[PDB]
Amino acid sequence: SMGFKVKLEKRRNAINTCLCIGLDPDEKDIENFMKNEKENNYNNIKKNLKEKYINNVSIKKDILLKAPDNIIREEKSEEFFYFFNHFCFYIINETNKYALTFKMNFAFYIPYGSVGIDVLKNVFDYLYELNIPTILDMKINDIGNTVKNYRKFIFEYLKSDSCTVNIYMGTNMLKDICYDEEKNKYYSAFVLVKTTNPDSAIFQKNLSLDNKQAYVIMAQEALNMSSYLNLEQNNEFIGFVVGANSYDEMNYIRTYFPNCYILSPGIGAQNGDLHKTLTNGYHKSYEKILINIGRAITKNPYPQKAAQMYYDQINAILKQNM
Amino acid sequence: GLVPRGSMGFKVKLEKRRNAINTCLCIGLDPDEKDIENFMKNEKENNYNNIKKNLKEKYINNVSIKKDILLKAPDNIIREEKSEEFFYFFNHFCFYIINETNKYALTFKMNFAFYIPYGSVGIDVLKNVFDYLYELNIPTILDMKINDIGNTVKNYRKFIFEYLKSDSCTVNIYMGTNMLKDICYDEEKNKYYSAFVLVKTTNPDSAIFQKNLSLDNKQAYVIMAQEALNMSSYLNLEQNNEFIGFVVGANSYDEMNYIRTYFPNCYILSPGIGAQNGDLHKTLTNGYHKSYEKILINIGRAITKNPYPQKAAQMYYDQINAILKQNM
Ligand SMILES: Nc1c(F)c(=O)[nH]c(=O)n1[C@@H]1O[C@H](COP(=O)(O)O)[C@@H](O)[C@H]1O
Ligand SMILES: Nc1c(F)c(=O)[nH]c(=O)n1[C@@H]1O[C@H](COP(=O)(O)O)[C@@H](O)[C@H]1O
Structure with missing residues (x-):
C-alpha cells in the first residue's frame, strides 16, 4: 500500500534510528537456544507464547503454540522446526523496538531443506x-x-x-x-x-x-534502471549495498549519489567501524543509511542489550552529524 | 578398478557418462506453474498414464521426502489429500521428464528459482x-x-x-x-x-x-x-577429480571462441539453445572439445514444454551428435 520508501520514512520518524537487525541463525545458534531453553525451563519460549502475533503466522501455528515439553514427546519430528522458529521469534521480540528494518539472509534458511523455508515464511x-x-x-x-x-x-x-x-x-x-x-x-x-x-x-x-x-x-x-522503471514515483527505490569497512567508497557513493539509499553490512562480526561508516554515509533522512548488525546481536547472549547499545550508539553518532 | 555410484569425483563421473552415451546434451529441468498445471490437467484427462509409469520405477522408493504421499494412487491424492495435490503433481511432473529423457542426458541442470516460489513445498520436490x-x-x-x-x-x-x-x-x-x-x-x-x-x-x-x-x-x-x-589451481581441484568451469552463453560466439582458445581444457556450460534461440552449430563449433563433457549444451524449455519430451530430447541429442561428428 504505502511503498517501501514511505514505510522506511514513517518508521524512522517513530523510532529514530537506522539500525537494521540481521537475522541469520546458524545451526549452532539453534542448537544453543534449544540447549539453553531446556536447561532454563523454556523461559524464552514461554515469553514467546504470550506475544499476540504468534497467533497470526501461516505455517504449523498449532505446533508453535504447543508447550515445549509436549513437542519433545508428542511432536518430536517437529522439534527442529519448533526451536528454529522460536529462536527467531525470541530475537525479534527482544530487539524489534530498536530496529528500523530486519534483514534475513536466505542462505541461513535453506540448508536443512523445506523446514527452514517454513520458518522463513x-x-x-x-x-x-x-x-x-x-x-x-x-x-x-x-x-x-x-x-x-x-x-x-x-x-x-x-x-x-x-x-x-x-x-x-x-x-x-x-x-x-x-x-x-x-x-x-x-x-x-x-x-x-x-x-x-x-x-x-x-x-x-x-x-x-x-x-x-x-x-x-x-x-x-x-x-x-530505477529511473527507467519510475520506482521513486511509485514510492519504491533501487539502492546500494556498500560495506561498512569500505570507507572511501561509502564517502564516494554518498558524495556522488547524494540521495541514494545505502544498506551497509560489516559492523560487529566483520569488524567495520560504526562511527566512520555512519559518518561517511550519513544523510539527514537516515533511513538512507541502514547499518546492518547480524551476528553481534544474534550471537550475543544478551541480544536485547546488544541491540540497545547499537541503537544508542547510532543515536549519539546521528546527533553529532546533526 | 570399479568404483560404486557416488564414490568418485565429478570429473570422472562426467567422463564415464560421456563415454557411455556419447553426447554433451544437458537437460534443464525448470518446471513453471503452467507446466505443473498442464501436467495435472493432462494426467486427469488420461487416467494418469504417466504417473502410473513413474510409480513402477524402482528408485522412486528411494527418495527422501513424503514417499507415503508420492506412492499413492493419483485419484486418492485428488479426493483424500487435497493439501498434498500440488506437491504430488509437481514432483510427478519432474519424475516424468526425468524418466522420459534421461537416456539422452549427459547431465541434468535444475534452476533453483523454479523450486522456491511456492515456499517449502518446491524444496521438498527439489530434494x-x-x-x-x-x-x-x-x-x-x-x-x-x-x-x-x-x-x-x-x-x-x-x-x-x-x-x-x-x-x-x-x-x-x-x-x-x-x-x-x-x-x-x-x-x-x-x-x-x-x-x-x-x-x-x-x-x-x-x-x-x-x-x-x-x-x-x-x-x-x-x-x-x-x-x-x-583459484581452482590453488585448491587442487583437478587433482581431486573436481573442477571450476565457466558459464558461457550459447549466443556469445566470440566469447566462446576466446575462452576455448585461451583456456583450451576448461569445462564450459552453455545455456541459451532452444527457447532463447542461440545458434547450436556456432556454439558447439566455437566451444568444441574432443572430450565433449567440456562443452555442455543446456536445453530446458524446448524439451520440457514439448508435449513429447522423450522425442524432443532425442531430436536435440541427435542434432548435437551430428554436429559433434562434423567436428569429429
Ligand atoms: N549481503 C552482504 C553483502 F553484500 C556484503 O558485502 N557483506 C555482507 O556481510 N552481507 C551480508 O550481511 C550480513 C552480515 O552479517 P553480520 O556480519 O553477521 O553482521 C550477512 O547476511 C552477509 O551475508
Ligand atoms: N544460468 C543461466 C545463465 F548463466 C545464462 O546466462 N542464461 C541462462 O539461461 N541460464 C539458465 O539456463 C536455463 C536456460 O533454460 P532454457 O532457456 O529453458 O533452455 C535457465 O535455467 C536459465 O536461468
Whole structure:
C-alpha cells in the first residue's frame, strides 16, 4: 500500500534510528537456544507464547503454540522446526523496538531443506504483523524469465518489502524483479556495489570503465534502471549495498549519489567501524543509511542489550552529524 | 578398478557418462506453474498414464521426502489429500521428464528459482528430484548462481553438496573469488566439489559489465575466468577429480571462441539453445572439445514444454551428435 520508501520514512520518524537487525541463525545458534531453553525451563519460549502475533503466522501455528515439553514427546519430528522458529521469534521480540528494518539472509534458511523455508515464511509473517519493514538478502541474479520466480517468492509469497540483487549479469533483470507489468506492482531492491569480503577489490575496484571503478559504473547503471522503471514515483527505490569497512567508497557513493539509499553490512562480526561508516554515509533522512548488525546481536547472549547499545550508539553518532 | 555410484569425483563421473552415451546434451529441468498445471490437467484427462509409469520405477522408493504421499494412487491424492495435490503433481511432473529423457542426458541442470516460489513445498520436490537423479547416477548441476561472504556461503555449500548431494552448482564470483574456498572446499570434512562460474551470460544486456568493464584491455569476463582458474589451481581441484568451469552463453560466439582458445581444457556450460534461440552449430563449433563433457549444451524449455519430451530430447541429442561428428 504505502511503498517501501514511505514505510522506511514513517518508521524512522517513530523510532529514530537506522539500525537494521540481521537475522541469520546458524545451526549452532539453534542448537544453543534449544540447549539453553531446556536447561532454563523454556523461559524464552514461554515469553514467546504470550506475544499476540504468534497467533497470526501461516505455517504449523498449532505446533508453535504447543508447550515445549509436549513437542519433545508428542511432536518430536517437529522439534527442529519448533526451536528454529522460536529462536527467531525470541530475537525479534527482544530487539524489534530498536530496529528500523530486519534483514534475513536466505542462505541461513535453506540448508536443512523445506523446514527452514517454513520458518522463513513465519518470520516474514510475524514481522509483517508487527509492521516492521523487511529485507530478504538473497543476492538474486538470473535472466528475465527465471528471475520472475524470485519476484513471486520474495514479493508475493513472503511479502517482503525489498531484497538484495547482484546485477553483474546485467541491469535489465531489475525490470522483472522491481516491476510486475501485469499487476502494475513496484518493489524495492538493494544492488551489490561494494562488498565486505577481503578480496572485494578484485572486480569491484580493479576493473574500470572510462575513468571510474566498476563499483561506480554499477551504482550508476542501477540508478538509471530505477529511473527507467519510475520506482521513486511509485514510492519504491533501487539502492546500494556498500560495506561498512569500505570507507572511501561509502564517502564516494554518498558524495556522488547524494540521495541514494545505502544498506551497509560489516559492523560487529566483520569488524567495520560504526562511527566512520555512519559518518561517511550519513544523510539527514537516515533511513538512507541502514547499518546492518547480524551476528553481534544474534550471537550475543544478551541480544536485547546488544541491540540497545547499537541503537544508542547510532543515536549519539546521528546527533553529532546533526 | 570399479568404483560404486557416488564414490568418485565429478570429473570422472562426467567422463564415464560421456563415454557411455556419447553426447554433451544437458537437460534443464525448470518446471513453471503452467507446466505443473498442464501436467495435472493432462494426467486427469488420461487416467494418469504417466504417473502410473513413474510409480513402477524402482528408485522412486528411494527418495527422501513424503514417499507415503508420492506412492499413492493419483485419484486418492485428488479426493483424500487435497493439501498434498500440488506437491504430488509437481514432483510427478519432474519424475516424468526425468524418466522420459534421461537416456539422452549427459547431465541434468535444475534452476533453483523454479523450486522456491511456492515456499517449502518446491524444496521438498527439489530434494526428491536430486535423490532420484542420484539413484539413477545421472550427473547434476544446481543452477543457483550463489554468491555471498565466506561465512554465509558455507550454508549454500551444505544445502547443495550435503543435502541435495549435487555434483556441481553455478556461482557468481563478482563479490570475490575467495568465496570459492567455502564452496568448492570443505575444510572440516576435507571434501572437494565442482562449480561453474558465470563468465558470459545470455541476457541481452550481458555486455554492460562483462564486456564493458576491463583491466588493461582484458575484458571483465576474461579476468573473471582467469581468477577462477587461478583459484581452482590453488585448491587442487583437478587433482581431486573436481573442477571450476565457466558459464558461457550459447549466443556469445566470440566469447566462446576466446575462452576455448585461451583456456583450451576448461569445462564450459552453455545455456541459451532452444527457447532463447542461440545458434547450436556456432556454439558447439566455437566451444568444441574432443572430450565433449567440456562443452555442455543446456536445453530446458524446448524439451520440457514439448508435449513429447522423450522425442524432443532425442531430436536435440541427435542434432548435437551430428554436429559433434562434423567436428569429429
Ligand atoms: N549481503 C552482504 C553483502 F553484500 C556484503 O558485502 N557483506 C555482507 O556481510 N552481507 C551480508 O550481511 C550480513 C552480515 O552479517 P553480520 O556480519 O553477521 O553482521 C550477512 O547476511 C552477509 O551475508
Ligand atoms: N544460468 C543461466 C545463465 F548463466 C545464462 O546466462 N542464461 C541462462 O539461461 N541460464 C539458465 O539456463 C536455463 C536456460 O533454460 P532454457 O532457456 O529453458 O533452455 C535457465 O535455467 C536459465 O536461468
